[PDB]
Structures are given as C-alpha cells and as structure tokens.
Design a protein around this ligand. Structure first.
Ligand code: MG
Ligand code: MG
Ligand code: MG
Ligand code: MG
Length: 127
RNA sequence: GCUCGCUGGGGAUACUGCGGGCCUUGGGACCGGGAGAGGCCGGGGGUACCCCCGGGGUAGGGGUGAAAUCCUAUAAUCCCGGG
C-alpha cells in the first residue's frame, strides 16, 4: 500500500538534526546531523548544511520504500530558547524537493507551565 | 515711667473650666444582596526538567566573537515504551 513515516527535525542555534522513523516512531530509518556534512563548526546551523543533510536522509529513506512523511519540528525548548533556528525551513523544503510527499506539518516544542530556573544568574550573560 | 509681680473688696457673664438636663451630624454596633491573587488547614492536578531500566540506530554531541575543557564504541546526541 503506502508506507508513511515521520521526520523529526531538531533545530537550534548550534546544530540541526534530521531523523526519519516509521509511522509509530519506534524504528529508525535514517539520521543525519549538520556536523556530518561540513567541516567548520561555524557552518553547522547554516541553511546549506540543512539542505545537504536533508538530501542524504531523504535518499536513504527512499531507497527503503518510504513514500511520504509527516513533519515534527522543534526548538530546544524547556528552559532554553523557544524559537527554532535558521535551518528548519531549509530542511523542510529540501525533503519535498528530493521526492518525498509531505503530509501535515506541526511544531512540538516543549513549553513549560512555569517550570524550572534557567542559567545565567539574575543578570544573565554580560557581554 | 520702672521692679509685668503680690494681695483686701465690689461688678459682668460672651468665651474656657466645673455641675445638671436634652440631642444626632463625627465615631461605633446590627441587618440585606453582592466583589476580591486577604490569611491558615486538608485533598486532587498541570506541563516542563533530571536520573534509572528495556527496544531502534551509529559517529559524533555540546559550546563560543573564534576555540578548548567536558560527554561519547561500557553505544552518546536523537526517537519510542515504562519506573
Ligand atoms: Mg559537530
Ligand atoms: Mg558558572
Ligand atoms: Mg568585552
Ligand atoms: Mg538503548
């Protein structure tokens, strides 16, 4: 019939991770991060690295019989920043261009209802 | 005039003081329908985060203006089921 999977995208200011699993999430199909396609630590969160990683993951998934994916994109969340980095949209676009169909798209960033205390003291980073 | 201070008598009753009588406006008591993260005690929850166990996967993760220390083949980061 139709084999559909899930693409988990983890986007921060330092890196990007693209992880394709099956429909239930318990079996991993492919997994690629920004540090596996570039040489400079400064280029890990760039959109171009996201495109490269997404292309590699999409090819590996396509060779195994996956047809389309639903997308779940997240920032670090918690007591860290709630906003996704610059590589999320580039990752989303590259998956479609590689040949996979796209289902529904939603963000699953974990948000606290007044949880724990963040780092930096009561004055924050002083730079 | 000064020693602005003392003392024997007579007169007045507006104000202050003292005694008596009569009030309700200030203050207090009580009744009615409502408002509020005011306080104390008991019970039930919400996501988030950390650690441990089991399944998948394999070479990086993290962090900076740029790096390094640090974590990772005793299988990390990431995903799933539980405590
Ligand atoms: Mg890296
Ligand atoms: Mg410190
Ligand atoms: Mg300075
Ligand atoms: Mg395991």
């Amino acid at each position: 019939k139709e084999k559909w999977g899930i693409a988990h995208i983890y986007s921060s200011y330092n890196n990007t991770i693209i992880h394709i699993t099956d429909i239930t999430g318990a079996e991993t199909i492919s997994r690629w991060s920004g540090g596996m396609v570039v040489k400079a630590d400064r280029d890990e969160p760039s959109p171009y690295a996201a495109m490269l990683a997404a292309r590699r993951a999409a090819e590996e998934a396509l060779e195994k019989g996956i047809v389309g994916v639903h997308i779940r994109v997240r920032a670090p969340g918690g007591s860290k920043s709630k906003t996704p980095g610059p590589g999320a949209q580039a990752a989303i676009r590259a998956l479609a261009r590689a040949g996979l169909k796209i289902g529904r798209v939603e963000d699953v960033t974990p948000i606290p209802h007044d949880g724990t205390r963040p780092k930096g003291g009561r004055r924050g980073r002083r730079v």
